[PDB]
Ligand binder design. Sequence first.
Ligand SMILES: [Mg+2]
Ligand SMILES: [Mg+2]
Ligand code: NA
Ligand code: NA
Lengths: 243, 237
Amino acid sequence: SLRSDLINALYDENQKYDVCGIISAEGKIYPLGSDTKVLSTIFELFSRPIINKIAEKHGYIVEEPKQQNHYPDFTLYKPSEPNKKIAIDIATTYTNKENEKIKFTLGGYTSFIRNNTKNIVYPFDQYIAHWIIGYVYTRVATKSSLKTYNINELNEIPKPYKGVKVFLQDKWVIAGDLAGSGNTTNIGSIHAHYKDFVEGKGIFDSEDEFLDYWRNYERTSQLRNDKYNNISEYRNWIYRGRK
Amino acid sequence: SLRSDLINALYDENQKYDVCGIISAEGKIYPLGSDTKVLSTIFELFSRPIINKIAEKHGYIVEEPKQQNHYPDFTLYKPSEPNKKIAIDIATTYTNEKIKFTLGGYTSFIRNNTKNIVYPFDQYIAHWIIGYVYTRVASLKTYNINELNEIPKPYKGVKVFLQDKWVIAGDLAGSGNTTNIGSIHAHYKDFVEGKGIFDSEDEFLDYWRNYERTSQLRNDKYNNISEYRNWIYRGRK
DNA sequence: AAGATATCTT
DNA sequence: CAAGATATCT
Ligand SMILES: [Mg+2]
Ligand SMILES: [Mg+2]
Ligand code: NA
Ligand code: NA
C-alpha cells in the first residue's frame, strides 16, 4: 500500500543517511545546531523527497501549502479521488536519554477541526486520512560545530543528535487528551514510549471520539475545570448528555 | 570594532555563498523548502561560524542558549567583563519594497529581568539584530555533490544587516498570541541606516514594557508612539 | 489585529 | 500541567 511503502521508505532512509549540515552551491558546509527548531526543519526537509517518490510510484499528486500557517505539510491525492485526500504532517521531539517517554504537538485544535476551512490547504472534509510522520532523537550537546567544512570533511562534522527513530501513524490514534501547547492551542499526543506510537496504543476509541474531544476542549484550565480536562471527564460529559 | 568586523564578515559571507541544501555524511543532498521556517533556520545556522570567528578575534566568549525558547541566540562577553554582555538575535523576512521584522517578546525579560533569557537582562549592554531579507522565488528530489549548481534555491537576493534592536524597533506588535515586538515597517536602507522612530533606547524599552496585549486594552492606553508620548505626559496613566 | 504554522520550558 | 516562550507570517 501507499502507507506501508511510505513508512518502509522513511524507515530505510533514516537508517541509511545521517544529515550533518547545510551546504552551499560553492561547496561550503555549515554544521547543524542541536535545538529543536533546527532539527524539526531538517527532518521535514529529509522527508520531502521520500514522500514524493512513494506518492508518485502510487499515482498520487503531492501538494504543499502555498501559504505559511496552513496545514498539512503534504496533501496527497489521486486525480480520480479528490475527496479521499491524505494529509501528512511531520512532528518531532527529543529525548535526553534514549528510550524515555515522549510527547508531540499535533497541530491546532481551534482551526479546521472546528472550522472545516481555516488554515487548511483543502477543506477538511475532502481528507479521509491524517497521518503523522513522527521523528524522535536523543539530543547531543554542540566547539567543532562552530566552524565551516568542505565536502572532503563530511564524515567529520559533529552531529547534534544520535539515535533518530521514525514512525508513521494516524493522527487520531496517537492523539492524547492534554494540550500540547497553550497560546498556540495545539492538540497534544499521548505521553508514552516510542513503541506505543508505532503500535497505536492511544487513548481514543475512534477517530470520531478524538475529533469530538478536541472540537470541544476548552482553551484554559479554568474553563476545562467546569467541562472536561481529560478523557475520563469527557466520557462522563458525553454520558450526561454533553453538559 | 567587534561590531564593524561582524557586519563586514556577514556582508562578505552572504556575497560569496548560496546555501542550497542539507547534506548527509554519506553525501546525499536534500533541497530546501521555500517557507520561512526553513529560511530562518538556514540563515541562523549560516551566521553561527561567522559570529564565533569574529567574537574569538576580539576575545569574546560565545554562548548559545541551552533552553531553545530562551533569548538571545548568541551571548558574547569577555571573561574579564562578565557584566558587559552583548546579545545577538537573528531575524528574517521576505520581499516580493518595505519590510518588517518580529523582534522578540515584549512580555518576558524586558518586564521581569530573568524570564526566558540566558543571563539576567541587566548583564547585557547591547542587543544586536542580524537581519536577513530575501526575495521568495515564485525541488522534491535528492542530489549528489556534482549537482550542487543544479539545485533550485527557494530565494533570490539575500541582503543582511546588523543594527541595534532599539533603533529598528517600531510601535506595532509583530505578532499577536506570541506578543512580539514589531520593527519599523520600512525600506531595507532604513534598517541599515538606523532610521527608526524611538528617541532613545530608554524610550523603546519603556514603550514595549508598557504595551498592552490586545487592541481593546491598548485603546485605553496607547497604540502607537504618539499615544505613548501622550501617556507619558499624562503621568503614565 | 489576532491567531496560525512547530515544540519547548518550567 | 498550564501557560507562555522561541520565529514570522496572513
Ligand atoms: Mg506540519
Ligand atoms: Mg532569535
Ligand atoms: Na507538531
Ligand atoms: Na524575529
